[PDB]
Design a protein around this ligand. Structure first.
Ligand SMILES: [Mg+2]
Ligand SMILES: [Zn+2]
Ligand SMILES: [Zn+2]
Ligand SMILES: [Zn+2]
Lengths: 48, 48, 96, 134, 248, 49, 44, 64, 55, 49, 55
């Protein structure tokens, strides 16, 4: 009871500002993903 | 025949002595109500 | 039918179109034995794994995590307001 | 999260928007009855069963029925009302009938009378009922 | 069902709870007791006759409510067995003629002959025996009952069909045809009607449909012709003046 | 004569084949109804592939 | 009582225990006429 | 089937504006302009006209 | 005999706004007034009657 | 703003128009109760009425 | 008849009723995470290059 009745003073939600990241982060994520893909290609060629 | 009448699932022993239909029971949809205790439930007035 | 959330986790319920059966004790010995054996306060901890089955759930837990930081300060008005909802309250206001 | 009444897959909804037509709907339902001659003497017929002649009836009211044995459209038929009066002749007259289910509170929409495939007279009745979100 | 304490003036049956309590004071005289609502020798020939009844009814092709009573009429005729020593197929055919009349839609013996081997005379003979056998009355024929299918067989529009019916109706009310078979009369009226519309047909074709001849219609026509103009309904649209109605 | 075959609605052998919306509405039929089902004793039946 | 044809909408009193057909149209689907006892609604 | 007489959220009267919307659009006013000229502004009252399907004009094709 | 059923029209009527400028203070609540079901002291009677004849 | 006290809400709420549907399962159709109702005849077990 | 808006929503006399106070977070009743992305209120008295009044 007391935490619901405080919770209408504080309030809560989920938008899509809660679901996005800054460019510095996105660029770093893209860099590592590209490197991982290249490594798989190197493994494939040696097997042949 | 009297074997098929006293036989298995929905017979006279698996269907009328162990499992039987009981009077005095009502079912209704559930909805929240945070103003109740744990010890309580809220019954509508037509079922009651 | 209307029930408290803390009771959702034993029954494994959710409120998107479930249905729940209710049985009514008729004699007086059976109402006494349900009262002294199987009430919902008497079944908080389980013998299966010697821990409780019911704990704070859903919004209440998130709000409690945000009600108990160190930068959270309550003015006099909502101290009056929130202390209106305690059934186990002394009658005394704690000094801030 | 507003007051706790929308926890664990629920929704709070505006009451004074429901009063302006929000998500209001209607609900129709039809019933069939067919008079039949199952035997040479056992014969059925649509008629208004009278208390002293017919015998197997319940004490429910039979005033809404017309002379034919069917309810004219427009009346407000509630639960446990009789809508079709069908009497069987006894080898005097032993009446049957059709009653509503419980808790309908409908309004009789329209009544149709015609002949089905094997040529027995039969009728269809449609009941209208409005459903406001709750 | 009897209570020692007091007399029972009324015992309502509660359909909803499947219960029986007595209103005047109250007592379940009965609680939870009311539930809430080659081998064939006989008629080997009768059994086959109803297949043959069905096989006879099938040719006419119509909702067979007439047939079930035809089956019960025979069953009844069979049971008395006063007329047992007679041909079954004639009785079946006679049962059939009767049912159509019993349904208020008789079919001509001529038609009934089409679906059976029995002479019209033997059907008529058997018919009277059944009337006597089952002791039941009949009804008189009306022309309009055959206005529908014949005009249909000619694909004549309702207006002609309905006009004919009035012409027929007016003619019989005036008895312009004393003793004349209403079949030949209806047909001449139909002829007159068809002759009053673009849908004209030769008497022989009509005669062929009514199962009669063209000379048979010619006489009946001669009897109705004097009143050809006035016999028509007030709601009609000529395709040919009554003056220009042919003579034969 | 041999017998009678059911007819799938809106086929080339139905009474509604190649009609215009002014006539489909005149027989109390919906111009948007797709067709492709049978009418058997009042009911509407559909065949599953 | 009084019935309404399903095609031409011409009212015609059909007597008890009588065949079900229109007149001037020859049709076999009849609709019963609306009642004359009055029922009141709420705009609510 | 027919334009509601009141917006479900505000309560502003929206029923009388249906014919006008068709006319302004007919005049080739772009939809954005038409709504503004009618005077609806809040995006709860614009949803009323922007997303309305008029089924009453197709039930008037069946003879009574 | 229109396309909408009876309870559809009874609902689109209640939401029509009536001029309530000055005579709301002279009207009793129909549950307080000492009259019968209705009287010109706690009510106002309307009437509609339309018939379509042209095509 | 809060509707009961008119105060502002500390968080900002995500609001916008969406498209909802009304399913067929209504509650007027799923409520039922029994208390000493009609019983059968042969086995005297509770029966529907 | 006569009534008010607690009976039914056909008896209330008003469309939307706007209301607001403290157009700039001088009291910090609401807390912006990034106070720069928020449009300035219609009633504000701040400069064009400010976000909130000082607490
Ligand atoms: Mg679930
Ligand atoms: Zn007609
Ligand atoms: Zn609005
Ligand atoms: Zn009054």
């Amino acid at each position: 009871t007391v935490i619901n009745n405080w919770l209408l003073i504080e309030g809560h939600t989920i938008g899509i500002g809660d679901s996005i990241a800054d460019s510095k982060t996105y660029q770093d994520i893209q860099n590592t993903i590209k490197k991982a893909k290249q490594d798989v290609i190197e493994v494939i060629e040696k097997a042949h | 025949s009297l074997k098929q009448r006293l036989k298995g699932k929905e017979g006279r022993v698996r269907g009328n002595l162990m499992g039987k239909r009981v009077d005095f029971s009502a079912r209704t949809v559930i909805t929240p109500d945070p103003n109740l205790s744990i010890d309580q439930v809220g019954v509508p007035r037509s079922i009651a | 039918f209307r029930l408290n959330l803390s009771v959702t986790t034993p029954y494994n319920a959710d409120f998107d179109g479930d249905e729940m059966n209710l049985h009514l004790p008729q004699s007086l010995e059976t109402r006494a034995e349900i009262q002294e054996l199987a009430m919902v306060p008497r079944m908080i901890v389980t013998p299966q794994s010697n821990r409780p089955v019911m704990g704070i759930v859903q919004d209440t837990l998130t709000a409690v995590r945000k009600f108990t930081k160190r930068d959270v300060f309550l003015e006099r008005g909502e101290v009056m307001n929130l202390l209106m909802f305690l059934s186990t309250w002394d009658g005394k206001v704690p000094q801030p | 999260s507003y007051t706790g009444y929308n926890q664990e897959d629920s929704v709070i909804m505006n009451r004074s928007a429901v009063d302006r037509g929000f998500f209001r709907s209607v609900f129709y339902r039809s019933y069939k009855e067919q008079e039949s001659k199952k035997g040479f003497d056992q014969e059925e017929v649509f008629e208004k069963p009278t208390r002293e002649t017919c015998q197997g009836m319940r004490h429910a009211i039979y005033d809404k029925l017309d002379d034919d044995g069917l309810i004219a459209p427009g009346v407000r038929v509630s639960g446990d009302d009789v809508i079709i009066g069908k009497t069987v002749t006894l080898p005097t007259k032993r009446d049957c009938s059709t009653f509503l289910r419980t808790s309908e509170t409908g309004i009789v929409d329209q009544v149709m009378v015609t002949l089905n495939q094997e040529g027995y007279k039969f009728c269809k009745i449609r009941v209208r009922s409005v459903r406001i979100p709750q | 069902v009897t209570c020692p304490n007091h007399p029972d003036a009324i015992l309502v049956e509660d359909y909803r709870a499947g219960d029986m309590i007595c209103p005047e004071c109250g007592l379940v005289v009965g609680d939870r007791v009311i539930d809430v609502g080659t081998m064939s020798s006989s008629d080997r020939a009768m059994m086959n006759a109803f297949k043959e009844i069905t096989t006879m009814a099938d040719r006419i092709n119509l909702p067979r409510n007439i047939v079930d009573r035809t089956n019960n009429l025979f069953k009844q005729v069979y049971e008395q067995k006063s007329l047992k020593g007679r041909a079954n197929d004639a009785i079946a055919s006679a049962c059939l003629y009767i049912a159509c009349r019993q349904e208020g839609v008789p079919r001509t013996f001529k038609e009934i002959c089409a679906v059976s081997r029995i002479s019209k005379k033997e059907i008529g003979r058997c018919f009277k025996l059944i009337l006597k056998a089952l002791e039941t009355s009949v009804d008189l024929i009306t022309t309009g009952d055959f206005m529908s299918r014949f005009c249909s067989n000619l694909c004549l529009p309702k207006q002609v069909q309905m006009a004919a019916t009035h012409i027929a109706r007016k003619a019989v009310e005036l008895d312009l045809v004393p003793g004349r078979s209403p079949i030949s009369v209806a047909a001449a009226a139909i002829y007159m009607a068809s002759q009053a519309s673009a849908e004209k047909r030769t008497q022989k074709e009509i005669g062929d449909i009514a199962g009669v001849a063209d000379v048979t219609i010619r006489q009946s026509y001669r009897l109705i012709y004097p009143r050809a103009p006035d016999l028509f309904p007030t709601d009609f649209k000529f395709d040919t003046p009554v003056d220009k109605l042919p003579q034969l | 004569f041999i017998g009678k075959i059911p007819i799938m609605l809106r086929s080339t052998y139905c009474l509604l084949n190649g009609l215009t919306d002014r006539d489909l509405c005149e027989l109390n039929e919906c111009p948007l109804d797709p067709g492709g089902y049978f009418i058997i004793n009042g009911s509407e039946k559909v065949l599953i592939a | 009582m009084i019935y309404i044809c399903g095609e031409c909408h011409t009212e015609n009193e059909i007597k008890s225990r009588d065949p079900i057909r229109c007149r001037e149209c020859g049709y076999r689907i009849m609709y019963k006429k609306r009642t004359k006892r009055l029922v009141v609604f709420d705009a609510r | 089937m027919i334009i509601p007489v009141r917006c479900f959220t505000c309560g502003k009267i929206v029923g009388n504006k249906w014919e006008a919307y068709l006319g302004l659009l007919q005049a080739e006013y772009t939809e954005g302009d038409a709504l503004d000229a009618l005077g609806l502004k809040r995006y709860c009252c614009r949803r009323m006209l922007l997303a309305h399907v008029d089924l009453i004009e197709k039930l008037l094709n069946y003879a009574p | 005999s229109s396309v909408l059923h009876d309870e559809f029209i009874a609902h689109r009527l209640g939401l029509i706004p009536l001029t309530s400028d000055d005579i709301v203070d002279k009207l009793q609540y129909s549950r307080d007034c000492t009259c019968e079901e209705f009287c010109p002291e706690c009510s106002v009677e309307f009437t509609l009657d339309v018939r379509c004849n042209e095509d | 703003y809060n509707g009961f006290t008119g105060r502002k809400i500390t968080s900002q709420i995500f609001i916008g128009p969406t498209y909802y549907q009304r399913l067929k399962h209504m509650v007027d159709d799923k409520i039922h109760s029994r208390a000493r109702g009609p019983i059968q005849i042969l086995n005297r077990q509770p029966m529907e009425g | 008849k006569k009534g008010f808006g607690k009976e039914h929503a056909k008896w209330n006399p008003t469309a939307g009723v706007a209301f607001e106070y403290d157009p700039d977070n001088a009291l910090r009743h609401t807390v912006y995470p990034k106070p720069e992305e928020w449009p300035k209120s219609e009633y504000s008295e701040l400069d064009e290059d400010e976000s909130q009044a000082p607490y």
